[PDB]
Each structure stands twice: as C-alpha cells, then as structure tokens.
Amino acid sequence: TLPSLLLIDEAAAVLGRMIQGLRTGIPYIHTENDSIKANPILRTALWQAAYVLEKAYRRRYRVPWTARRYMRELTPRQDGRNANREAVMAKEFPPGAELNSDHPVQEILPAMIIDAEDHILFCYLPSCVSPAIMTIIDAAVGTLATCKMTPGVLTFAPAWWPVGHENQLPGPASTLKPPKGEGRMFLSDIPIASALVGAILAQINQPLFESGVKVLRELYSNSKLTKDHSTVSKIIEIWFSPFSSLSLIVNRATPIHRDTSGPIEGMDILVTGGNYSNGVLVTPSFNRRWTYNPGCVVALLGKLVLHGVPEVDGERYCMAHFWRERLFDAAGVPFPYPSKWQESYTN
C-alpha cells in the first residue's frame, strides 16, 4: 500500500529479468507496472544498466583472501590514514597474481572484484546511468546547490541520529524536516535516479536489497520506533531507495580511506556526476585505478575497500547510498552477509 517501495521492488524484478534475458537469448517479460512501462527514461535506463551489469559479471578479478579474514584484522576505526597500519594490512592482504601485474593500467571496462570464497567486494559500472537520468540529477543538484555549485556535504534519511543524539530514538534528518524545504524538494526531483540505483543493488546483492526494503516497511508501519513519526512516514513515502541514507557530496575530492560508520559488511553505491573529464577512483588494495566520469556507478564494501578520488577538471558531485545497521537492529531485521557472485545466476 506504499507505492514507492512497490516501484523499486518492480524495478529490481524487471532489471533482473532483463539480465536473465541477455544471458539466455530468450525474450524477457515486461513489467506490467506502468510507472516503469510508461516511463521511457526509467525503462531505457534499466536496459542500459542491464547491459553494463551483465558486462561486469563476465569480468571478475579474484584476490587471494576472504572478506572475513580482512575484516578480522581491521581495528574498529581504521579509516586508512595510518600509513604504517595500512602497509601491514597490504602485506598481509596483497592483491594477488590476477591483479598485481607490476605497475597497473587504469581500468575502463565494467568489472568486479570477488574474494577467495566468491564474495563481491567491488563492482565497477562505467556509464551505467543514461544521459537522461544524469541530466535529472544535474538539474536536481543544481537547484539544491544554488564554484557554480556551492561545495559541501548534505545527508538525507527518513530515520537518523544527529551527532549528539545517539542514545535517543532516531527521527527525520534535519535536512528533510521542512516539508517544502530544499531537502524534500531534492528527493522529489530524483525518484527515477533512486529507483535505478536500488535496482542495481538488487542485481548485486538481492538479500541486502530486500532487507533494506523490509526495514523501511517496518519503520513506516511501527510508530514506536522513531521520533516525529509523521515526518518519518511522509519521507518514506517519497523514499525510492532501499538504502538507509543518501549523501550528496558536491565539489569535494576524497582522500584514500575506509568508511568506519556503517556495517562492516554493507555495500554502498556511489554515483558520480558533473561536467569533468578526468575522473579516477583509486583502490590501492586491488592495485587498480578506475576511470570515474559522469554516470559511473561503483558498488563496494566501503568499510573494507580503501578508495579515494582525486581533484578533477570541473564541477563534480557524488551521490553516496549507504546503511545504518542500528535501523536494522531497531526493525528486527538481521543485516545479511555479502552476496556471492553466483547468486546472480540462480534463477
């Protein structure tokens, strides 16, 4: 009875069917949900994502360690700045023969990196987002941000803890409390984009997608879980995403680092955009750089994978979709462990 969740559910389903079709050569079944079917921009964006993701599953680098063991050496707040600690990790967890060809060339083709037991650590999807959707995001960010976009970070979530309120109940993000403010407006401008990124997540880690949606369901229906539940409810009704949170990072370069808030096993999804030509995402553990230009998507275990992105020759923003495990705890949903790549093929 919550149509936004039902739309991202169908977007996930129909994109999976598109991928299964590309793999089998049999016509895929269209969605009868005409929020998708009658929306040419979202529909063709799902086609494009299907091509890129199918390209990525066919191009898999393996590191010779597991995510479990890597996670075990990690100190609770090992964000990547201790260079000595990082060189010790790097010896204990080297790139391996499939990756550490001497000095690495920059990747441009879609690909993924899986651990020793087939878990997806990193998924690189260049040009995964159609120009039309990138233009929707360009407009939304534009009107929100007014060098030509004022730098900064801005965070949105229907259920959240502000810094200093950790031990109270969670509630609407301050940026989203004004019902006609900048925040809500921004969310209202981007449901097609949100729906796309959530569908991509389903293709990479279906259980995590449906856990997230389950959590949003429970936060909607169960009032005793949050402050200001009326505002929580209104925001969930325009929350076209399975993620706990969305963060817009405008005109900022990013040092090589690890996230340390968020579950050690959560997969974030970054979408980069703007008008610049020399984007590069750096992953030292994988001995790799990845071309990182507007419309690129990267999914990654970001509390595990060191990643950074240098200054570029233009305006740039990044949309970062991520997780708060405490919301899972509060909603009675265990947080799932990272999916294996074969799960993509279990039809």
Ligand X SMILES: O=C(O)CNC(=O)C(=O)O
- What span, in angstroms and rounded, lies between the C-alpha atoms of 5 and 27? 26
For residue 114, what is the enclosing H or E element?
A: strand 111-114
Considering only the C-alpha atoms of the chain, give the largest distance between any 2 of them, rounded to a whole number of Å. Answer: 57
Residue (17 or 321) nearer to Mn ion, CB = 321
Q: How far is the CB of 20 from ligand X (least distance, A)?
A: 31
Q: How far is the CB of 219 from Mn ion (least distance, A)?
A: 24
- What span, in angstroms and rounded, lies between the C-alpha atoms of 235 and 268? 21
| Partner that binds at residue 272, options Mn ion, ligand X, none, CB closer than 5 to 8 Å by kind | ligand X
For residue 274, what is the enclosing H or E element?
A: strand 268-275
| Partner that binds at residue 176, options Mn ion, ligand X, none, CB closer than 5 to 8 Å by kind | none
- Please report which residue ranges of the chain form alpha helices under DSSP H: 3-24, 34-37, 40-57, 67-73, 83-92, 131-145, 182-189, 191-204, 206-221, 229-236, 325-331
* Binding footprint of ligand X on the chain (CB under 6 A): 249, 254, 259, 270, 272, 302, 307, 309, 318, 320
Pair type for strands 268-275 and 296-300: antiparallel
Cross-strand partners of 283: 288
| Partner that binds at residue 309, options Mn ion, ligand X, none, CB closer than 5 to 8 Å by kind | ligand X
Q: How far is the CB of 23 from ligand X (least distance, A)?
A: 30
> Could you say whether residue 302 binds Mn ion (CB under 5 A)?
yes
Q: Which listed range, 178-186, 222-230, 254-262, 283-291, lies at the site for Mn ion (CB under 5 A)?
A: 254-262
Amino acid at 80: G
Q: Which listed range, 10-18, 78-86, 157-165, 300-308, lies at the site for Mn ion (CB under 5 A)?
A: 300-308
Residue (16 or 266) nearer to ligand X, CB = 266
Q: How far is the CB of 86 from ligand X (least distance, A)?
A: 16
Residue ranges that bind Mn ion, judged by CB under 5 A: 259, 302
